């Protein structure tokens, strides 16, 4: 199947409370493998998967240097950006940056991404072709102009099509037992009379990986899109995910309803009935 390597960066200015807070995290698919906290004691890039720990001192020195440079870059950006938006020095503001690559099932480049947000809003983003920028504001166009001038697109495209894909493959091999696994969902149903003339059917999927799953309720084969309560897929904390979907059904109609579970770890989609 397809895979992704993704880095997420958050910088939060805290006026009179110190240097901005900086948090970096890296994923391969739905597994975190690294982290940096500006407030942490190590002041290093740190492992958060066992398969990355086998990388040598060169890697960790290399990744600390680069992430410290990401942190500094955002420190300037925070100050620049408040200037661009004529904002005060006393308010706290947030810079977010995401970048990474997807590979298809053939393990060749599929997509690259680079997006940047000020105070939770699209600011500047690299376009699909990894050649051009999408600038939200006129301030973004000033960044757009800086970056076009410095040929950022070209430097970043090389990373996303090249280095990013190369390292994603190394991680998929080093972490083959964890990253190239599918944990099929453990499924069950519950029934709860919500009143005296209707009941709740809850369809459960537990211990699944990857996070991607489809839970649908049908009545006589007809999907019940607008009648389904559907929680956001959630982490178990052990590297697996959970989800449920619920319908409220008249008492006596239970058997008309089927839950359908679609997940990559399942040879066939599961049909579950009460």
């Amino acid at each position: 199947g397809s895979h992704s390597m993704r880095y997420f960066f958050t910088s939060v200015s805290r006026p009179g409370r110190g240097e901005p807070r900086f948090i970096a995290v890296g994923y391969v698919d739905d597994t975190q493998f690294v982290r940096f906290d500006s407030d942490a004691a190590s002041q290093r890039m740190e492992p958060r998967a066992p398969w990355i720990e086998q990388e040598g001192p060169e890697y960790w020195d290399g990744e600390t240097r680069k992430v410290k440079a990401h942190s500094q870059t955002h420190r300037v950006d925070l100050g620049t950006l408040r200037g661009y938006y004529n904002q005060s020095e006393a308010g706290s503001h947030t810079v977010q940056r995401m970048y990474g690559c997807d590979v298809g099932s053939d393990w060749r480049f599929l997509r690259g991404y680079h997006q940047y947000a000020y105070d939770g809003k699209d600011y500047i983003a690299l376009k699909e072709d990894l050649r051009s920028w999408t600038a939200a504001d006129m301030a973004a166009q000033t960044t757009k102009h800086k970056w076009e001038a410095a040929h950022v697109a070209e430097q970043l495209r090389a990373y996303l099509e090249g280095t990013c894909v190369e390292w994603l493959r190394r991680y998929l091999e080093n972490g083959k037992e964890t990253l190239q696994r599918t944990d099929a969902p453990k499924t069950h149903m519950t029934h709860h009379a919500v009143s005296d003339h209707e009941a709740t059917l809850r369809c459960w999927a537990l211990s699944f990986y990857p996070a991607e799953i489809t839970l649908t309720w049908q009545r006589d084969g007809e999907d019940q899109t607008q009648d389904t309560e559907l929680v956001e897929t959630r982490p178990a904390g052990d590297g697996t995910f959970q989800k449920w979907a619920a319908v409220v059904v008249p008492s006596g109609q239970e058997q008309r309803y089927t839950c359908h579970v679609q997940h990559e770890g399942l040879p066939k989609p599961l049909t579950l009935r009460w």
Binding site: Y7, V67, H70, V76, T80, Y116, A150, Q155, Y159, T163
Partner: peptide, 9 residues
């Protein structure tokens, strides 16, 4: 591995 960041906004 991380991108070699260059260029502030």
């Amino acid at each position: 591995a991380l991108w070699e960041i260059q260029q502030v906004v």
